[model samples]
Target: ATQGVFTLPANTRFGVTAFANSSGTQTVNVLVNNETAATFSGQSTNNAVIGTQVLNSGSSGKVQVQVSVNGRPSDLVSAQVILTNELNFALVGSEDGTDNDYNDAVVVINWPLG
Candidate 1:
């Protein structure tokens, strides 16, 4: 799994979504104040768009996505920025990509999906 840090304003509206790819399942966990406020999961980069949710933290703070595979952090887990609107940013994620391609499990942070 992978982690990234982001700062936000007092009233930040964050949305999360995940896409499953390469044959397994994944959960995108969003944490604020060290507590998970939202999570999206799916088992597609091949078929479907998983659960999507939006959360208004109502406060400025740090955010991270702690990832793991079999209880240990996977080397393929990562957070990559895809888009941004100044203070607001978007990220794409990959899980257990042993083939070195991010098409395994995908996640969008601050990025919308249906």
Candidate 2:
């Protein structure tokens, strides 16, 4: 299991990107704040799958993000977490009031996906 702890501001959003190796199939589970947030599973040859969640109401304080690999072998699994305040380019300044700058509130983390 690969885990990371991050303290993101309230109302922020996060996501997970995972990939499996072609040698075999793999399952990746994502947990936020000690709760299961999202899960992804795929074969090594397929593209990446992403799981996204928002830090809404009761989701603030301390944010805990965890990733785990199951099935096949751990070496065939890889995953990461991405955090952003803005949903997309259209949101822009409407959400966080950052004018047109979007990257101002974006963070990306690579899980210790063995």
Candidate 3:
């Protein structure tokens, strides 16, 4: 299991990537501020995408990501929560949230079906 904390402004959105290896079934859960936002599970080496999540701490708080594993004793899981504005809505002035740069919006679309 892995735990981390980060700071960011409101309206900020991010994505997640989870990987796991297991003989039976394993799960990777993504939590934001102690709340579960997304979960991925599978058997063997698996990959998953969390889409996008917003940071609205309602005044003051730290952004948190927790990776928890649950399954057989042989199961192993790891994950990464990425902070980015690329997924932010194309509002007013910015027009395109990527700032005319495709590189910033690039993401892996491959994910295991669980």
lDDT of each: 0.59, 0.35, 0.33
lDDT per residue (tens digit) for residues 24-113 in model 2: 344444445667665555544343433333332125523443322343222211123344832321111001222433211122333222
- Off-target runs (Cα >4 Å) in candidate 1 are 45-47, 69-72, 76-87, 111-114
Model 3 error, position 103 (Å): 27
Candidate 2 vs candidate 3: the TM-score winner is: 2
How good is model 1 by TM-score? 0.70
Instruction: Specify the poorest-scoring 10-residue window by lDDT in model 1.
Output: 74-83
> What are the per-residue Cα lDDT tens digits for candidate 3 across 1-114?
432444434443444443333233444444556676665554442333323333343233334433333522221222233336232221100011223321111122111112
What ordering of candidates by TM-score runs from best to worst?
1, 2, 3
Lowest summed lDDT across 10 adjacent residues in model 3 is found at 89-98
Per-residue lDDT for 7 in model 2? 49
Q: Compare candidates 1 and 3 on lDDT and give the better one.
A: 1
Candidate of highest lDDT: 1
